[PDB]
Each structure stands twice: as C-alpha cells, then as structure tokens.
Design an enzyme around this catalytic site. Structure first.
Site, short mmCIF file in Angstrom:
data_model
loop_
_atom_site.label_atom_id
_atom_site.label_comp_id
_atom_site.label_asym_id
_atom_site.label_seq_id
_atom_site.Cartn_x
_atom_site.Cartn_y
_atom_site.Cartn_z
N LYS A 290 5.53 -1.75 7.72
CA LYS A 290 6.50 -1.03 6.92
C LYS A 290 7.83 -1.75 6.93
O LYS A 290 8.48 -1.82 7.94
CB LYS A 290 6.70 0.43 7.40
CG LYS A 290 7.90 1.09 6.72
CD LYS A 290 7.68 2.54 6.36
CE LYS A 290 8.58 2.97 5.19
NZ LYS A 290 8.53 4.45 4.92
N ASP B 249 8.64 16.88 8.35
CA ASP B 249 7.85 16.55 7.15
C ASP B 249 6.36 16.41 7.47
O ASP B 249 5.74 15.41 7.18
CB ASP B 249 8.38 15.24 6.54
CG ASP B 249 7.96 15.06 5.10
OD1 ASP B 249 7.43 16.04 4.52
OD2 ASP B 249 8.15 13.94 4.57
N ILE C 231 0.76 -1.24 0.00
CA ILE C 231 0.00 0.00 0.00
C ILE C 231 0.79 1.30 0.00
O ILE C 231 0.28 2.33 0.41
CB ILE C 231 -1.01 -0.02 1.21
CG1 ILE C 231 -0.27 0.06 2.57
CG2 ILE C 231 -1.86 -1.28 1.14
CD1 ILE C 231 -1.19 0.10 3.77
N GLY C 232 2.03 1.25 -0.49
CA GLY C 232 2.85 2.44 -0.54
C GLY C 232 4.34 2.18 -0.46
O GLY C 232 4.79 1.53 0.47
N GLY D 276 8.67 3.58 -1.86
CA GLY D 276 9.69 4.61 -1.85
C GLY D 276 10.85 3.89 -1.17
O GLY D 276 10.58 2.94 -0.44
N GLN D 277 12.11 4.27 -1.39
CA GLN D 277 13.15 3.53 -0.68
C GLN D 277 13.33 3.95 0.77
O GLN D 277 13.71 5.07 1.09
CB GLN D 277 14.51 3.56 -1.39
CG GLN D 277 15.19 2.20 -1.21
CD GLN D 277 16.67 2.17 -1.55
OE1 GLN D 277 17.07 2.42 -2.69
NE2 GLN D 277 17.50 1.85 -0.55
N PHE D 278 13.02 2.98 1.62
CA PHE D 278 13.06 3.05 3.07
C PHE D 278 11.98 2.04 3.39
O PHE D 278 11.40 2.02 4.46
CB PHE D 278 12.69 4.45 3.60
CG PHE D 278 13.78 5.11 4.41
CD1 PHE D 278 15.00 5.45 3.81
CD2 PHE D 278 13.60 5.39 5.76
CE1 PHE D 278 16.02 6.05 4.55
CE2 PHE D 278 14.61 5.99 6.51
CZ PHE D 278 15.83 6.32 5.90
N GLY D 279 11.71 1.21 2.39
CA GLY D 279 10.72 0.16 2.53
C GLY D 279 9.40 0.33 1.81
O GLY D 279 9.05 1.40 1.32
N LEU D 280 8.67 -0.78 1.74
CA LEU D 280 7.36 -0.82 1.14
C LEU D 280 6.44 -0.91 2.36
O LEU D 280 6.91 -1.21 3.43
CB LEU D 280 7.20 -2.10 0.29
CG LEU D 280 8.31 -2.50 -0.70
CD1 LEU D 280 7.77 -3.57 -1.64
CD2 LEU D 280 8.79 -1.28 -1.49
#
EC number: 2.7.10.2
Length: 245
Positions: free
Chosen positions: A35, A126, A13-14, A16-20
C-alpha cells in the site's frame, strides 16, 4: 523491519487517496500486498506513527505486515498478500455457495480479530466486509485498521467512536456476511437511514442467518453502547451458536 525497494510491483488492486495498493513480491519468495501513500495524503509522521502501532498489533486474524518502505519514493506498507480479495468481494461472487456454518465461521474470524483489538484498546472506525480479507482457505482477517450505514448512533450524532461502535458495525458486517455481500439499507439516504434506526428499525434477518445469529446482530444493534456485548463476549456467544444452531 524497514524495506528498501526489494519489491516488484505487479498490478494495482485498489485505490482512493491515501495510496494505491499493489500486488507485488518481496525477494520473489513472498507475494505481498503493497500500500503506497501519495504525496500530501499523510504526514510522514502520521503514517510512521501508524505503521508502528500496526506492527505492535498481532493476531492470527489480523493481516500481517512484512515491513515498511521509507527508503523513499512513494512511501509504503508491505502486507502479506491475502489470496482471495476483500470479504465483500468474496461474498458477492460465490453467492449461494456458502453454508451457514461457513458464514458464521467467517464472523468468528472477524470477531476473534476484533476481541484482540478491543483488548488492545484499538478502535476500528470502519469495520465492514469491504475491509475484511479472505485468504488461506476461508480464513478471514481484518485489515485497513490502524459510512453512516455501518455507524452506531453515538457516531451518527456525536462522532463518538469507542469499541462498542465497532460491535455495532460488526453487527452490520455480520449482516453483510449472512446476506452474502448485500448492501445494508441500499435503497435509503444517510439523512434517511439515521431516521429508521433512531425510531427502532433494524436490518432484516437474512435467510441464511439463524434466529440465534439474528439475536446477536440485534444485540450489536442495541441503541445503548453499554447494552452491547463486548467483542470478548461476542466471540463466546458466537462460539456456542456455531456448535449446533
């Protein structure tokens, strides 16, 4: 509270590098959000030190963690599943069906969570709608804790985060809420937005934002950090407004 692979990986469900991030279940009895990391995306220490602090911070407006999986394979973080996707995602679809009273409601949820983090000396480098989750009936919690469009000036120029940088960002989050998921300064360049803000330009007042709500967004958007309301202050100003207009 470490977790061995007692997780069932359902869907993705989402990324980016730093995990799925996967939709999953722990012992079935629990629909969680998992995560994972990657491979060389985070020091084993880097994430460990991070999962700890995250388990040290707790408020009804922060997304809850079930534990961590260090018992190998892509190391991961088991969160409680937020039944309605991220905020930004919730505001866009579902546009128009919100009552201002509901949008403000959402801001206080994030405000409460932030006042708690503020007091916890944590800075959310962020804070945006995309990192907010909708769950148990409109209830909004802030995650991904522990983008020059959302940056304060001291972040633009000096990369100087603080907790007031957050407030600034919060001001823009508030804007995304009231705009109902709109992209702040959409038609503009990062090497251009910095221009408009520096001269004194600010995000326009969205139709659903009362003039009173707009006043607070502009207080978060003051150029001087010390001129910005602390979240603890922000929470009460928003509480007063919410009661009437």
């Amino acid at each position: 509270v470490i977790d061995p692979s007692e997780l069932t990986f359902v869907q993705e469900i989402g990324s980016g590098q730093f995990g799925l991030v996967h939709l999953g279940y722990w012992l079935n009895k629990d629909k969680v959000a998992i995560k994972t990391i990657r491979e060389g995306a985070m020091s084993e220490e880097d994430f460990i030190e991070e999962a700890e602090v995250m388990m040290k911070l707790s408020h009804p407006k922060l997304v809850q963690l079930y534990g961590v999986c260090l018992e190998q394979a892509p190391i991961c973080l088991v969160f409680e599943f937020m039944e309605h996707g991220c905020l930004s995602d919730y505001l866009r679809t579902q546009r128009g069906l919100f009552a201002a009273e509901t949008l403000l409601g959402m801001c206080l949820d994030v405000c409460e969570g932030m006042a708690y983090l503020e007091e916890a000396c944590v800075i959310h480098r962020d804070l945006a709608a995309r990192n907010c989750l909708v769950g148990e009936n409109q209830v909004i919690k802030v995650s991904d804790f522990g983008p020059v469009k959302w940056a304060s000036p001291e972040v633009f120029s000096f990369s100087r985060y603080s907790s007031k940088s957050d407030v600034w960002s919060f001001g823009v989050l508030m804007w995304e809420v009231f705009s109902e998921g709109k992209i702040p300064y959409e038609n503009r360049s990062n090497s251009e937005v910095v221009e408009d803000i520096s001269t004194g330009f600010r995000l326009y007042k969205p139709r659903l934002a009362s003039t009173h709500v707009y006043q607070i967004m502009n207080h978060c958007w003051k150029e001087r950090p010390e001129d910005r309301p602390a979240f603890s202050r922000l929470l009460r100003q928003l509480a007063e407004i919410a009661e009437s207009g």
